[PDB]
């Protein structure tokens, strides 16, 4: 039986699985009213990708396809007829919530659309268009293969093969950024399908442990931080996919260790569905040694008692 | 002794190590007048990172720091005084060619600068500034901890903590995109230092094999492609770093296989310094089967004679 392992990576060597930026810190908090059901960065410990999860950070919140004119709409002047960010054709009957890498938070995603290359004499950055992709728009239906593009300053051409590169997130006065409210992948008139399950602590005193990043915010949240919290770093997703080690229990005991001193800084529970819990009550940003990393200890029973941290 | 392995990844499951976009195909050509000395995606088979190579694709061609106003009527309206991912000033005495992840191609890099968050009422994408970072500017001195920012869209504010997210590449009438001309990391008046070595075939009939991507081009190259070719995909760099398997010969004989049939499509030499050669004469794009992947076969010496492909 292939033993289960974690990659040996420090907190500065991890990528957020829900937005293509590095992990900044570990963070724990109670769920209070949030339903924690993100769809990117979802992978079982034995290597089954779930939700909209794929292997490349450069595909997370990225889109590719062909633009379609949508003149007359207030918000979305054009649509993007999607494929997978792979470039492989997208079939709405695929058993996924949306094309892999589709944004899994509610609100406005900001990025740059690139289209057919233009001549040098056309001018600077004339094949770059700043664009909003909002999930509250009626045209956000990636499950059906089409999303709406809100142009900001630059003209988006119809009928051109186009690539959307994410840059950050946005918040205006009627569209709050809500990282734990799933989009309606098929529009407000249809239920989501093929979702990775919601996660929550099930042992007394435990809280979810998140891998936290601050995403750039191009509008709103003055003096505040746009946080995107993921359950697994992209590197863990890819490691579990590569290894496909059979899971021997619902929960694995893991430790954050200093490899030079051998000290366990804290213990945590790694759950089969692909998330972590720690024994703590309250919102708490962890600070962890630059050389520290998680290590797999053993498979334990669901009601194993972690050392408080 | 820890056996050497490659990750099991198809061509579309690989990330370019020189720009955060997926690999699309393989490519081989003679060096003729190109000095092949890229500094990102450089890693020995036993896991030693070289040049400016680090582990996160989300850090390649990404920059962070504090803006400083630049006087005069010239190309760069602002400078970016660089900082580590923690916010501490960069150290020019580090034995590296430049901060890790610095762009290693000459020409114009395009992306979006984000700064202090602005209120919701300030307007759409008002904390997003489209920007050119040109290596032919006298202000491109990342080794010294400062790069020049040419504003295109939105005003860049000085004295603000800022992040640069890369989107693509550009070419105007006097700045060609030259992927094999290393930038002068300390400006045009200083020699590069601490470089990973240039690579070339040394066995008769062999050519370098590259992992090839098409990078978005926001100005120029109409009807043409901006290619970025790397020696190793980011996933191979990270795998070798993780495994740190001792190299047992000068060359790891590797084989591209189609798992549906078990058939070998071609074989290649994976040199212990971290680059691939194949037996071929001429420029040739390799459209590889989408389900295929490289596999490590065995250790051989530098005088192994590859089967021509």
Numbering used by the authors:
A (entry chain C), B (entry chain A): 3 to 311
Question: What do the authors report?
Answer:
OIF P domain was reported to bind Lea antigen but the GII. These included a single mutation (N297Y or G361E) and a double mutation (N297Y/G361E), aiming to restore the Lea binding function. Unexpectedly, oligosaccharide-based binding assays showed that all mutant P domains retained their original pattern of binding to Lec/lac/mucin core 2 glycans and did not bind to Lea antigen. Also, an attempt to shift the binding of GII.
Human noroviruses (huNoVs), members of the Norovirus genus of the Caliciviridae family, are the leading cause of acute gastroenteritis (AGE) and are associated with almost 20% of all AGE cases worldwide.
